[PDB]
Design a protein around this nucleic acid. Sequence first.
DNA 1: GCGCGCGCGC
DNA 2: GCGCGCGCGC
Lengths: 98, 99
Amino acid sequence: ARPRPREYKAGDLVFAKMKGYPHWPARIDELPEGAVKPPANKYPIFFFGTHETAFLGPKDLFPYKEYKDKFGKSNKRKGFNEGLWEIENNPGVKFTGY
Amino acid sequence: MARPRPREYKAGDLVFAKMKGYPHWPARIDELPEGAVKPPANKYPIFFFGTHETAFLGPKDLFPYKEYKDKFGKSNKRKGFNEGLWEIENNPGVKFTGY
DNA sequence: GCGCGCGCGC
DNA sequence: GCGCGCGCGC
Protein backbone atom coordinates (compact mmCIF):
# COMPACT_ATOMS: atom_id res chain seq x y z
CA ALA A 1 0.00 0.00 0.00
CA ARG A 2 1.73 3.16 -1.25
CA PRO A 3 1.87 5.51 1.73
CA ARG A 4 0.30 8.91 1.80
CA PRO A 5 3.03 11.54 2.04
CA ARG A 6 4.36 12.70 5.42
CA GLU A 7 5.32 16.18 4.29
CA TYR A 8 3.66 18.56 1.86
CA LYS A 9 4.72 21.83 0.21
CA ALA A 10 3.06 25.14 -0.54
CA GLY A 11 0.72 24.80 -3.49
CA ASP A 12 -0.05 21.08 -3.44
CA LEU A 13 -3.69 20.20 -4.11
CA VAL A 14 -5.28 17.76 -1.70
CA PHE A 15 -8.47 16.54 -0.13
CA ALA A 16 -8.57 17.58 3.51
CA LYS A 17 -10.49 15.95 6.35
CA MET A 18 -12.18 17.60 9.32
CA LYS A 19 -14.68 15.91 11.64
CA GLY A 20 -18.23 16.49 10.45
CA TYR A 21 -17.19 17.25 6.89
CA PRO A 22 -16.47 14.91 3.97
CA HIS A 23 -12.98 14.79 2.45
CA TRP A 24 -12.85 18.33 1.09
CA PRO A 25 -11.01 19.74 -1.94
CA ALA A 26 -8.20 21.85 -0.58
CA ARG A 27 -4.70 23.31 -0.90
CA ILE A 28 -1.46 23.62 1.11
CA ASP A 29 -0.86 27.33 1.64
CA GLU A 30 2.51 28.98 2.04
CA LEU A 31 3.90 29.36 5.52
CA PRO A 32 5.40 32.80 5.49
CA GLU A 33 8.48 33.70 7.29
CA GLY A 34 7.64 36.33 9.87
CA ALA A 35 4.76 34.66 11.67
CA VAL A 36 4.06 32.75 14.81
CA LYS A 37 5.33 29.22 14.36
CA PRO A 38 2.60 26.64 13.67
CA PRO A 39 2.08 23.45 15.68
CA ALA A 40 4.67 20.87 14.82
CA ASN A 41 4.11 19.12 11.55
CA LYS A 42 0.79 20.76 10.96
CA TYR A 43 0.15 22.36 7.59
CA PRO A 44 -1.70 25.56 6.57
CA ILE A 45 -4.86 24.51 4.79
CA PHE A 46 -7.07 26.51 2.36
CA PHE A 47 -10.44 24.88 1.64
CA PHE A 48 -11.78 25.49 -1.88
CA GLY A 49 -15.34 26.75 -2.26
CA THR A 50 -15.47 28.10 1.27
CA HIS A 51 -12.01 29.71 1.44
CA GLU A 52 -11.96 28.73 5.10
CA THR A 53 -8.58 27.84 6.56
CA ALA A 54 -7.01 25.57 9.18
CA PHE A 55 -3.97 23.61 10.16
CA LEU A 56 -3.82 19.88 9.56
CA GLY A 57 -1.25 17.10 9.58
CA PRO A 58 -0.47 14.56 6.76
CA LYS A 59 -2.73 12.03 8.51
CA ASP A 60 -5.69 14.06 7.22
CA LEU A 61 -4.37 14.98 3.80
CA PHE A 62 -4.80 13.10 0.53
CA PRO A 63 -3.09 14.00 -2.77
CA TYR A 64 -5.75 15.36 -5.16
CA LYS A 65 -5.23 13.26 -8.28
CA GLU A 66 -4.44 9.97 -6.47
CA TYR A 67 -7.47 10.10 -4.23
CA LYS A 68 -9.68 12.06 -6.61
CA ASP A 69 -12.29 9.54 -7.54
CA LYS A 70 -12.71 8.13 -4.05
CA PHE A 71 -13.47 11.69 -2.89
CA GLY A 72 -14.40 13.88 -5.84
CA LYS A 73 -18.07 12.88 -6.02
CA SER A 74 -20.66 15.64 -5.74
CA ASN A 75 -22.20 16.33 -2.36
CA LYS A 76 -24.64 18.93 -1.02
CA ARG A 77 -22.67 20.51 1.87
CA LYS A 78 -22.54 24.26 1.23
CA GLY A 79 -19.53 25.17 -0.90
CA PHE A 80 -18.45 21.60 -1.77
CA ASN A 81 -19.49 21.57 -5.41
CA GLU A 82 -18.02 25.06 -5.69
CA GLY A 83 -14.76 23.64 -4.35
CA LEU A 84 -14.72 20.85 -6.89
CA TRP A 85 -14.97 23.57 -9.47
CA GLU A 86 -12.20 25.79 -8.10
CA ILE A 87 -9.64 23.02 -7.58
CA GLU A 88 -9.77 22.27 -11.30
CA ASN A 89 -10.30 25.69 -12.90
CA ASN A 90 -8.83 28.24 -10.47
CA PRO A 91 -6.65 26.33 -8.02
CA GLY A 92 -4.63 29.41 -7.11
CA VAL A 93 -7.34 31.59 -5.56
CA LYS A 94 -5.65 33.61 -2.87
CA PHE A 95 -2.45 31.63 -3.28
CA THR A 96 0.37 33.70 -1.84
CA GLY A 97 3.03 31.01 -1.97
CA TYR A 98 4.16 31.79 -5.48
CA MET B 1 -14.17 -24.42 38.84
CA ALA B 2 -17.08 -22.85 36.92
CA ARG B 3 -20.84 -23.61 36.84
CA PRO B 4 -22.15 -25.24 33.67
CA ARG B 5 -24.84 -23.54 31.70
CA PRO B 6 -27.78 -25.93 31.36
CA ARG B 7 -27.65 -28.48 28.48
CA GLU B 8 -31.44 -28.83 28.69
CA TYR B 9 -34.05 -26.08 28.73
CA LYS B 10 -37.77 -26.12 29.56
CA ALA B 11 -40.66 -24.37 27.75
CA GLY B 12 -41.13 -21.06 29.48
CA ASP B 13 -37.55 -20.57 30.59
CA LEU B 14 -36.12 -17.03 30.22
CA VAL B 15 -32.69 -16.58 28.69
CA PHE B 16 -30.30 -14.39 26.78
CA ALA B 17 -29.94 -15.93 23.32
CA LYS B 18 -26.88 -15.31 21.19
CA MET B 19 -27.09 -15.07 17.42
CA LYS B 20 -24.35 -14.36 14.91
CA GLY B 21 -24.05 -10.60 14.48
CA TYR B 22 -26.33 -9.68 17.35
CA PRO B 23 -25.61 -8.92 21.01
CA HIS B 24 -26.60 -11.56 23.60
CA TRP B 25 -30.35 -10.99 23.61
CA PRO B 26 -33.34 -11.24 26.01
CA ALA B 27 -35.38 -14.26 25.03
CA ARG B 28 -37.56 -17.22 25.98
CA ILE B 29 -37.91 -20.97 25.40
CA ASP B 30 -41.19 -21.71 23.67
CA GLU B 31 -43.05 -25.00 23.66
CA LEU B 32 -42.50 -27.53 20.93
CA PRO B 33 -45.91 -29.17 20.68
CA GLU B 34 -46.35 -32.58 19.14
CA GLY B 35 -48.12 -32.55 15.79
CA ALA B 36 -45.42 -30.42 14.14
CA VAL B 37 -42.35 -31.16 12.02
CA LYS B 38 -39.80 -32.36 14.57
CA PRO B 39 -37.06 -29.85 15.41
CA PRO B 40 -33.43 -30.46 14.61
CA ALA B 41 -31.68 -32.46 17.34
CA ASN B 42 -30.92 -30.63 20.63
CA LYS B 43 -32.13 -27.24 19.43
CA TYR B 44 -34.87 -25.26 21.16
CA PRO B 45 -37.47 -22.84 19.77
CA ILE B 46 -36.44 -19.35 20.74
CA PHE B 47 -38.65 -16.27 21.20
CA PHE B 48 -36.81 -12.93 21.10
CA PHE B 49 -38.34 -10.10 23.13
CA GLY B 50 -38.66 -6.67 21.55
CA THR B 51 -38.51 -7.91 17.97
CA HIS B 52 -40.68 -10.97 18.53
CA GLU B 53 -38.50 -12.77 15.95
CA THR B 54 -38.05 -16.54 16.31
CA ALA B 55 -35.45 -19.24 15.62
CA PHE B 56 -33.96 -22.51 16.83
CA LEU B 57 -30.75 -22.52 18.89
CA GLY B 58 -28.86 -25.01 21.07
CA PRO B 59 -27.80 -24.83 24.79
CA LYS B 60 -24.39 -23.43 23.85
CA ASP B 61 -26.03 -20.22 22.65
CA LEU B 62 -28.40 -19.87 25.60
CA PHE B 63 -27.70 -18.28 28.97
CA PRO B 64 -30.10 -18.42 31.99
CA TYR B 65 -31.58 -14.93 32.38
CA LYS B 66 -31.21 -13.98 36.06
CA GLU B 67 -27.78 -15.50 36.39
CA TYR B 68 -26.40 -13.71 33.37
CA LYS B 69 -28.53 -10.64 33.78
CA ASP B 70 -25.87 -8.23 34.83
CA LYS B 71 -23.29 -9.28 32.21
CA PHE B 72 -25.74 -8.84 29.28
CA GLY B 73 -28.57 -6.71 30.61
CA LYS B 74 -27.32 -3.18 30.01
CA SER B 75 -28.80 -0.95 27.37
CA ASN B 76 -27.98 -1.51 23.74
CA LYS B 77 -29.23 0.50 20.81
CA ARG B 78 -29.98 -2.34 18.35
CA LYS B 79 -33.61 -2.05 17.29
CA GLY B 80 -35.94 -3.61 19.86
CA PHE B 81 -33.22 -4.42 22.43
CA ASN B 82 -34.26 -2.07 25.19
CA GLU B 83 -37.88 -2.92 24.32
CA GLY B 84 -36.85 -6.50 25.02
CA LEU B 85 -35.19 -5.79 28.37
CA TRP B 86 -38.49 -4.21 29.27
CA GLU B 87 -40.63 -7.13 28.13
CA ILE B 88 -38.51 -9.85 29.73
CA GLU B 89 -39.28 -8.30 33.14
CA ASN B 90 -42.81 -6.94 32.78
CA ASN B 91 -44.61 -8.98 30.14
CA PRO B 92 -42.41 -12.04 29.66
CA GLY B 93 -45.22 -14.37 28.62
CA VAL B 94 -46.19 -12.29 25.64
CA LYS B 95 -47.45 -14.62 22.94
CA PHE B 96 -46.49 -17.60 25.16
CA THR B 97 -48.50 -20.60 24.08
CA GLY B 98 -46.44 -22.99 26.17
CA TYR B 99 -48.75 -22.69 29.16
C1' DG C 1 -26.31 -0.70 12.45
C1' DC C 2 -28.13 3.27 13.90
C1' DG C 3 -29.02 8.03 15.42
C1' DC C 4 -27.53 13.08 14.15
C1' DG C 5 -27.30 16.67 11.44
C1' DC C 6 -26.93 19.42 7.44
C1' DG C 7 -29.25 21.41 3.62
C1' DC C 8 -33.18 21.39 0.35
C1' DG C 9 -38.48 21.00 -0.42
C1' DC C 10 -43.30 21.43 0.17
C1' DG D 1 -40.70 26.45 9.44
C1' DC D 2 -41.21 21.50 9.37
C1' DG D 3 -40.49 17.24 6.88
C1' DC D 4 -37.38 14.07 4.80
C1' DG D 5 -32.95 12.08 2.55
C1' DC D 6 -28.50 11.10 3.03
C1' DG D 7 -24.04 11.17 4.78
C1' DC D 8 -21.53 11.59 8.97
C1' DG D 9 -19.52 9.61 13.42
C1' DC D 10 -19.95 6.15 17.26
